[PDB]
Design brief:
It is found in: Endoplasmic reticulum membrane; Endosome membrane; Early endosome. The chain is mainly β. The protein has one helix and seven strands. Helices cover 3% and strands 12% of the residues. The protein has a five-stranded parallel beta sheet, with no helix packed on it. A two-stranded parallel ribbon has the order 6-7. The protein is globular and about 55 Å long. It starts with 7 loop residues before the first strand and ends in a 17-residue tail after the last strand. The structure holds 2-acetamido-2-deoxy-beta-D-glucopyranose. 2-acetamido-2-deoxy-beta-D-glucopyranose binds next to loops. It binds one RNA strand of 81 nucleotides through loops.
Length: 168
RNA sequence: AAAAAAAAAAAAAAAAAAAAAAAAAAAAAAAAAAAAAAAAUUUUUUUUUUUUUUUUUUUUUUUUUUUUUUUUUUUUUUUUU
């Protein structure tokens, strides 16, 4: 099964077909990376409500439900790199007010609309790379008060304009 | 028909590390070899120059014996004109 080993559920390559929810729920770090994940269940995380950070990356996940943000209010690191994520919106990030780290290395998010990060105030580093971005614009209002890293690499931005860079 | 994410295999090529070895070249250390130049203990041989002993040839010198001719100093008994 998973490693556990003092609150670091580093679940390595074990061909886990479904997301497990075992007895050791009193942990803070859980690693779903390198595990067969069809999608993240919005209701299966009730058992593990003490996950300070989670590592669910490289997995094949279609879309993210808003419930995941409210089932785990104490969420700091959201590493979701190398996923499908055909389309995303602000609704899935409504309850993620304590988010501080995000990783998205391959998601093919060509178009971004509205303000997906209106509720993210403590989000420090941003990793939006290799997602086929055509413009660097993220919104029209002023948001992301405390941002230190904005990674936009391997994308297809053609030019930079003052209108699309005024959101910070 | 096309494009991508977890999850398991296999094939060509390039650059690497470790281990078991095997050859070629180069360094010493030992056991020997063939020699052209070397030194040192013993017994012998040839040749040159010199020492000692013995036996003999030639020449020279001293002494003694004997023999033959000359200068001869004398004589006794006689002869002698
Ligand atoms: C949630 O748990 C149920 C019951 O164990 C299971 O049937 C379902 O597949 C799980 N879903 C996810 C997303 O883990």
């Amino acid at each position: 099964q998973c490693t556990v080993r003092y609150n670091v559920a580093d679940c390595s390559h074990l061909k886990l077909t479904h997301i497990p929810d075992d007895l050791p729920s009193n942990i803070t770090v859980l690693n779903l990376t390198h595990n067969q994940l069809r999608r993240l269940p919005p209701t299966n995380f009730t058992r593990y409500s003490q996950l300070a950070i989670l590592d669910a990356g490289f997995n094949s996940i279609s879309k993210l439900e808003p419930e995941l943000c409210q089932i785990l209010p104490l969420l700091k690191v959201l590493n979701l790199q190398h996923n499908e994520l055909s389309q995303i919106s602000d609704q899935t990030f409504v309850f993620c007010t304590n988010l501080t780290e995000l990783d998205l290395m391959s998601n093919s998010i060509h178009k971004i609309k509205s303000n997906p990060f209106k509720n993210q105030k403590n989000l420090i580093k941003l990793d939006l790379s290799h997602n086929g971005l055509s413009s660097t614009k993220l919104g029209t209002g002023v948001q992301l008060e405390n941002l230190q890293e904005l990674l936009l690499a391997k994308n297809k931005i053609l030019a930079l304009r003052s209108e699309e860079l005024e959101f910070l």
